[PDB]
Write an enzyme that holds these catalytic residues in place. Structure first.
Site, PDB file in Angstrom:
ATOM      1  N   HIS A 265       0.979  -1.368  -0.019  1.00  0.00           N
ATOM      2  CA  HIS A 265       0.279  -0.030   0.192  1.00  0.00           C
ATOM      3  C   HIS A 265       0.361   0.961  -0.280  1.00  0.00           C
ATOM      4  O   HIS A 265      -0.332   2.315  -0.415  1.00  0.00           O
ATOM      5  CB  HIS A 265      -0.765  -0.106   1.019  1.00  0.00           C
ATOM      6  CG  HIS A 265      -1.626  -1.380   1.217  1.00  0.00           C
ATOM      7  ND1 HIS A 265      -2.155  -1.014   0.454  1.00  0.00           N
ATOM      8  CD2 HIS A 265      -1.573  -2.188   1.887  1.00  0.00           C
ATOM      9  CE1 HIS A 265      -2.644  -2.996   0.862  1.00  0.00           C
ATOM     10  NE2 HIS A 265      -2.880  -3.093   2.027  1.00  0.00           N
TER      11      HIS A 265
ATOM     12  N   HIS B  80       5.819   7.183   6.608  1.00  0.00           N
ATOM     13  CA  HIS B  80       5.127   6.389   4.567  1.00  0.00           C
ATOM     14  C   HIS B  80       4.728   7.407   4.208  1.00  0.00           C
ATOM     15  O   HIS B  80       4.390   8.581   4.571  1.00  0.00           O
ATOM     16  CB  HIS B  80       3.817   5.749   5.248  1.00  0.00           C
ATOM     17  CG  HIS B  80       2.927   5.476   6.267  1.00  0.00           C
ATOM     18  ND1 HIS B  80       2.443   5.519   7.042  1.00  0.00           N
ATOM     19  CD2 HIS B  80       1.438   6.408   4.753  1.00  0.00           C
ATOM     20  CE1 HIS B  80       1.506   6.615   7.223  1.00  0.00           C
ATOM     21  NE2 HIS B  80       0.619   6.599   5.897  1.00  0.00           N
TER      22      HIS B  80
ATOM     23  N   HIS C  50       2.442   9.269   0.858  1.00  0.00           N
ATOM     24  CA  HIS C  50       1.041   8.650  -0.465  1.00  0.00           C
ATOM     25  C   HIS C  50       1.127  10.055  -1.454  1.00  0.00           C
ATOM     26  O   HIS C  50       2.137  10.811  -1.254  1.00  0.00           O
ATOM     27  CB  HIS C  50      -0.735   9.632   0.075  1.00  0.00           C
ATOM     28  CG  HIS C  50      -0.599   8.907   1.387  1.00  0.00           C
ATOM     29  ND1 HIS C  50      -1.418   7.325   1.890  1.00  0.00           N
ATOM     30  CD2 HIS C  50      -0.448   8.547   2.506  1.00  0.00           C
ATOM     31  CE1 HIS C  50      -1.525   7.188   2.673  1.00  0.00           C
ATOM     32  NE2 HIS C  50      -0.965   7.970   3.575  1.00  0.00           N
TER      33      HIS C  50
ATOM     34  N   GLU D  17      -3.556  13.426   0.011  1.00  0.00           N
ATOM     35  CA  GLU D  17      -4.651  12.986   0.720  1.00  0.00           C
ATOM     36  C   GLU D  17      -5.438  14.275   1.286  1.00  0.00           C
ATOM     37  O   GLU D  17      -6.320  14.062   0.337  1.00  0.00           O
ATOM     38  CB  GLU D  17      -4.661  12.405   1.778  1.00  0.00           C
ATOM     39  CG  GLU D  17      -3.265  10.619   1.065  1.00  0.00           C
ATOM     40  CD  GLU D  17      -3.985   9.326   2.243  1.00  0.00           C
ATOM     41  OE1 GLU D  17      -3.689   9.830   3.974  1.00  0.00           O
ATOM     42  OE2 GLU D  17      -4.421   8.660   2.175  1.00  0.00           O
TER      43      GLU D  17
ATOM     44  N   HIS E 247       3.848  11.329   6.367  1.00  0.00           N
ATOM     45  CA  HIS E 247       2.633  10.798   6.954  1.00  0.00           C
ATOM     46  C   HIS E 247       3.765  10.551   8.197  1.00  0.00           C
ATOM     47  O   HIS E 247       4.200   9.060   7.849  1.00  0.00           O
ATOM     48  CB  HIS E 247       1.211   9.983   7.084  1.00  0.00           C
ATOM     49  CG  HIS E 247       0.223  10.520   6.509  1.00  0.00           C
ATOM     50  ND1 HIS E 247      -0.599   9.753   5.718  1.00  0.00           N
ATOM     51  CD2 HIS E 247       0.027  11.989   6.094  1.00  0.00           C
ATOM     52  CE1 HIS E 247      -1.532  10.651   5.200  1.00  0.00           C
ATOM     53  NE2 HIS E 247      -0.999  11.705   4.996  1.00  0.00           N
TER      54      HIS E 247
ATOM     55  N   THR F  34      -6.431   7.562   7.481  1.00  0.00           N
ATOM     56  CA  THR F  34      -6.672   7.257   6.094  1.00  0.00           C
ATOM     57  C   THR F  34      -6.435   5.610   5.702  1.00  0.00           C
ATOM     58  O   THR F  34      -7.117   5.939   4.188  1.00  0.00           O
ATOM     59  CB  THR F  34      -5.415   8.219   4.880  1.00  0.00           C
ATOM     60  OG1 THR F  34      -4.562   7.657   4.518  1.00  0.00           O
ATOM     61  CG2 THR F  34      -5.616   9.421   6.184  1.00  0.00           C
ATOM     62  N   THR F  35      -6.305   4.692   6.082  1.00  0.00           N
ATOM     63  CA  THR F  35      -6.079   3.886   5.395  1.00  0.00           C
ATOM     64  C   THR F  35      -6.925   2.841   6.161  1.00  0.00           C
ATOM     65  O   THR F  35      -6.856   2.766   7.809  1.00  0.00           O
ATOM     66  CB  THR F  35      -4.603   2.734   5.103  1.00  0.00           C
ATOM     67  OG1 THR F  35      -3.790   3.103   6.602  1.00  0.00           O
ATOM     68  CG2 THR F  35      -3.833   3.269   4.328  1.00  0.00           C
TER      69      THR F  35
HETATM   70 ZN   LIG Z   1      -0.513   8.186   5.584  1.00  0.00          ZN
END
Ligand SMILES: [Zn+2]
Ligand code: NA
Ligand code: NA
Ligand code: NA
EC number: 4.2.1.1
Length: 258
Positions: free
Chosen positions: A62, A92, A94, A104, A117, A196-197
């Site tokens: 992911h 991590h 995005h 995001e 993040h 957010t996951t």
């Molecule tokens: Zn994140």
């Protein structure tokens, strides 16, 4: 049939396994900079990363994630909207298929090329698992990435991605200094939200910095060489691994600055 970012398993499907996806405090959100209220009582934000100890980097199918040794009182976030001390456990990213999308959070509907993040847990709950279940358990420092000049402090990350191309791969990743990922200003917006996951837990105080970091086109292109798939499976590039903005519902976004 695992959750992901594609047509059949992406964000619009997540609510079936994770009904909180349609909850009252979901993230990310669009930050309406005109509606956000300056809060002159927020305490100064303190990001104290000088003793951070990175351990490993992983591709989880992911994102890619750097985990820290959080067994001691090191790399911590406090002040601002936070009560007590929050300890860094991982970061991590995005990112998008193109430079015009990938973040995001959005700012007056603007999408950045990527979002970092830095995830921290409230030390009053003893470790990250227990903290993740509490309404004030986690704090995520979010930092936007725009494409322009290179970020020298990101390069060590970029250069190890070739070793974790596919889901399930990990590598040792010591002595990485997350201070090299921070912009000059700590001006921020803050609001109560969620992971957010999946599992999308509503346990995060979000602190989103106003100032993006610049990374080069070459740096972000290396993110886009990662794979969602495992080794030996049909290649699906890890791109557009971002959840879109969710309903703000009754929430107020506070600004640290006028
Ligand atoms: Zn994140
Ligand atoms: Na953790
Ligand atoms: Na800067
Ligand atoms: Na997507």
């Amino acid at each position: 049939h695992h959750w992901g970012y594609g047509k059949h398993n992406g964000p619009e499907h997540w609510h079936k396994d994770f009904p909180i996806a349609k909850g009252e405090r979901q993230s990310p959100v669009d930050i309406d900079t005109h509606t956000a209220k300056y809060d002159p009582s927020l305490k100064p934000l303190s990001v104290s990363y000088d003793q951070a100890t990175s351990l490993r980097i992983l591709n989880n199918g992911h994102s890619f994630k750097v985990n820290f040794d959080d067994s001691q009182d090191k790399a911590v976030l406090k002040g601002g909207p936070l009560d007590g001390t929050y300890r860094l456990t991982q970061f991590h990213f995005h990112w998008g298929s193109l430079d015009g999308q990938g973040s995001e959070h959005t700012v007056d509907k603007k999408k950045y090329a990527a979002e970092l993040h830095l995830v921290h847990w409230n030390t009053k709950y003893g470790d990250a698992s227990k903290a993740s279940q509490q309404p004030d358990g986690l704090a995520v420092l979010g930092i936007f990435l725009k494409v322009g000049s290179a970020k020298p402090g990101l390069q060590k990350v970029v250069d190890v991605l070739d070793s974790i191309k596919t889901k399930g791969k990990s590598a040792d990743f010591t002595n990485f200094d997350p201070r090299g990922l921070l912009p000059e200003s700590l001006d921020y917006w803050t609001y109560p939200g969620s992971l957010t996951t999946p599992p999308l837990n509503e346990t995060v105080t979000w602190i989103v910095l106003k100032e993006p970091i610049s990374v080069s086109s070459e740096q972000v292109l290396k993110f886009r060489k990662l794979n969602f798939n495992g080794e030996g499976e049909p290649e699906e590039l890890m791109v557009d691994n971002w959840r879109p903005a969710q309903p703000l519902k009754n929430r107020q976004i506070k600004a640290s600055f006028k």
